[PDB]
């Protein structure tokens, strides 16, 4: 199952990368603000137990903790593209979490 | 609560995830991420890699493949499961496939 | 009136000829087509070298990347701007300073935040947009003290007048950083507009229409994007510039609006905008509102060059090339990411 997920990861990350370019096209240089303006995480990961057999395997589980992310309309006010961009990466993260669990 | 995801990658990779809502400062004002620029050296990447591996609040680390090669010795040196390290394609670097840590752990995989 | 068309070329005659001569070199639709018909970054360079653009990737890394094309294009227009800005006299230079102010505003937002989260100025300056520059000290070596940066700004930085809305430092710590930057931008736009109206000749008539559009553009886009966030309707209204067509009546409806349809219903009262919301089909595979705004803004910036005796040609000049830079990078990105079906998302600049 690990390889099938890896293949999907490729397709998903490609779409997110393009979407970022789209946000950049409108916004210009928002990356500096996002990188400097960091304080709390909205996404966190909890450990869970998977009883695969007599052996128990550690798995990651996505936890949507909920603390609000930074809302930025400062660059060209390109909120629609940045909002789609957040969603594209948010989806990527969930797949990656699943992916890490598969590595174990 | 439990674990954070650390990111070591280029400008667009880190920016994207940060918007994804992942990444934050600890009480020591440290960031669970590094932006790797053309002027970033090996010691800086390796030191950051090690600190995440020795940091008990991280766990999954997301890195670019081209970085995975730059400090590749550190990726095989650590064999555990908390520190699951996932290798991703950068905006321009091409799709990864070879030199996957897992494909190496198991030599029976496509 | 008889105010323009007389003394204008006495000092500004050279710059008017130069800037229009520079505009003459902007990529045409025929040139964009040649850039699209590449599918390779190296071929993109070779085709671009057919115009006034080119020879700026020489002596750079053998691999061609988007980050290089982006930075180099910005640098080209900054140098040309600085040249014209340096060869200029107060009557015109003050106008140009406003243009630079828009970038300084973003840069000082960067200087704060980083100062508030212990970052040194030397670390922040490399990421500041050109033309901000900040050759003045005291803003430099602030010792990561917000008070020292605040005082240096009040004193040495020309933007001090704009910060009168955001003062006492308390505002810097308690206000959301984006509210501070939107507030400062409002102050800038309001002052710049008034400046253009003080120059009550051709410049006022040629320039204000563009500024008035931007003001109304901010009201529309801010209202829509603000729907999904946490912001008081009154505080949102506080950010709406008063130099536009929505100010007499219209902003009151956007301030109360909680939906896209209500915002469009406001546009329905302004045919110049109604058409934009109708064009912004917003389909899963169509253009959106921001795209139509860019198309309209460029049309205005092109029409700006129908007046030969004003300062608005320089404002449009910078903004027009900025979009051209966006267009060129877009093509490079489409090549780099191999999405040829998305290539026709550039804004033609005529």
Curated annotation (Swiss-Prot), chain B:
It holds the Pfam family ATP-synt_F. It comes from the Eukaryota. Its main location: membrane. The keyword Nucleus does not apply. It is a peripheral membrane protein. Expressed in brain (at protein level). GO terms for cellular component: clathrin-coated vesicle membrane; extrinsic component of synaptic vesicle membrane; membrane; proton-transporting V-type ATPase complex; vacuolar proton-transporting V-type ATPase complex; vacuolar proton-transporting V-type ATPase, V1 domain. GO terms for biological process: synaptic vesicle lumen acidification. Subunit of the V1 complex of vacuolar(H+)-ATPase (V-ATPase), a multisubunit enzyme composed of a peripheral complex (V1) that hydrolyzes ATP and a membrane integral complex (V0) that translocates protons. V-ATPase is responsible for acidifying and maintaining the pH of intracellular compartments and in some cell types, is targeted to the plasma membrane, where it is responsible for acidifying the extracellular environment. V-ATPase is a heteromultimeric enzyme made up of two complexes: the ATP-hydrolytic V1 complex and the proton translocation V0 complex. The V1 complex consists of three catalytic AB heterodimers that form a heterohexamer, three peripheral stalks each consisting of EG heterodimers, one central rotor including subunits D and F, and the regulatory subunits C and H. The proton translocation complex V0 consists of the proton transport subunit a, a ring of proteolipid subunits c9c'', rotary subunit d, subunits e and f, and the accessory subunits ATP6AP1/Ac45 and ATP6AP2/PRR. Belongs to the V-ATPase F subunit family. This is V-type proton ATPase subunit F.
């Amino acid at each position: 199952k690990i390889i099938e997920t890896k293949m999907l990861m490729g397709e998903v990350m490609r779409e997110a990368a393009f979407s970022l370019a789209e946000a950049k096209f409108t916004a210009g240089d928002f990356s500096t603000t996002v990188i400097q303006n960091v304080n709390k995480a909205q996404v966190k990961i909890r450990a869970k137990k998977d009883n695969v057999a007599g052996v128990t395997l550690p798995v990651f589980e996505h936890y949507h903790e909920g603390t609000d992310s930074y809302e930025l309309t400062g660059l060209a006010r390109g909120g629609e593209q940045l909002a789609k961009l957040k969603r594209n990466y948010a989806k990527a993260v969930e797949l990656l979490v699943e992916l890490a669990s598969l590595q174990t | 609560r439990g674990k954070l995801i650390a990111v070591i990658g280029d400008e667009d990779t880190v920016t994207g995830f940060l918007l994804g809502g992942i990444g934050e400062l600890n009480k020591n004002r440290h960031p669970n991420f590094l932006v790797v620029e053309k002027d970033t050296t090996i010691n800086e990447i390796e030191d950051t890699f090690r600190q995440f591996l020795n940091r008990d609040d991280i766990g999954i680390i997301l890195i670019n493949q081209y970085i995975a090669e730059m400090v590749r010795h550190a990726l095989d040196a650590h064999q555990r499961s908390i520190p699951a390290v996932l290798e991703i394609p950068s905006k321009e670097h091409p799709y990864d496939a070879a030199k996957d840590s897992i494909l190496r752990r198991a030599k029976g995989m496509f | 009136s008889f105010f323009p068309e007389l003394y204008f070329n006495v000092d500004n005659g050279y710059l008017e000829g130069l800037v229009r001569g520079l505009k003459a070199g902007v990529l045409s639709q025929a040139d964009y087509l040649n850039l699209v018909q590449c599918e390779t970054l190296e071929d993109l360079k070779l085709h671009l070298q057919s115009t006034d653009y080119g020879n700026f990737l020489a002596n750079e890394a053998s691999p061609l990347t988007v980050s290089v094309i982006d930075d180099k294009l910005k640098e080209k227009m900054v140098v040309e701007f600085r040249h014209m800005r340096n060869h200029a006299y107060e009557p015109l230079a003050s106008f140009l300073d406003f243009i630079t102010y828009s970038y300084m505003i973003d840069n000082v937002i960067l200087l704060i935040t980083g100062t508030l989260h212990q970052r040194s100025i030397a670390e922040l300056v490399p990421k500041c947009h050109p033309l901000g520059s900040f050759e003045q000290m005291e803003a430099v070596n602030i010792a990561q003290t917000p008070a020292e940066l605040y005082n240096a700004i009040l004193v040495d930085t020309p933007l001090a007048a704009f910060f009168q809305d955001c003062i006492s430092e308390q505002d810097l710590d308690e206000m959301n950083i984006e509210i501070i930057r939107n507030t400062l931008y409002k102050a800038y736009l309001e002052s710049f507009y008034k400046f253009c109206t003080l120059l009550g000749g051709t410049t006022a008539d040629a320039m204000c229409p563009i500024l008035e559009f931007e003001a109304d553009r901010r009201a529309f886009i801010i209202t829509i994007n603000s729907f999904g966030t946490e912001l008081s309707k009154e505080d949102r209204a506080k950010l709406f510039p008063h130099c536009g067509r929505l100010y007499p009546e219209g902003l009151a409806q956007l301030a109360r609006a909680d939906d896209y349809e209500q915002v469009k219903n406001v546009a329905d009262y302004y045919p110049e905008y109604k058409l934009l919301f109708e064009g912004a089909g917003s389909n899963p595979g169509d253009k959106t509102l921001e795209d139509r705004f860019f198309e309209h803004e460029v049309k205005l910036n092109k029409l700006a060059f129908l007046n030969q005796f004003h300062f608005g040609v320089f404002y449009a000049f910078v903004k027009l090339k900025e979009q051209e830079c966006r267009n060129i990078v877009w093509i490079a990105e489409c090549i780099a990411q191999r999405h040829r079906a998305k290539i026709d998302n550039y804004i033609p600049i005529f």
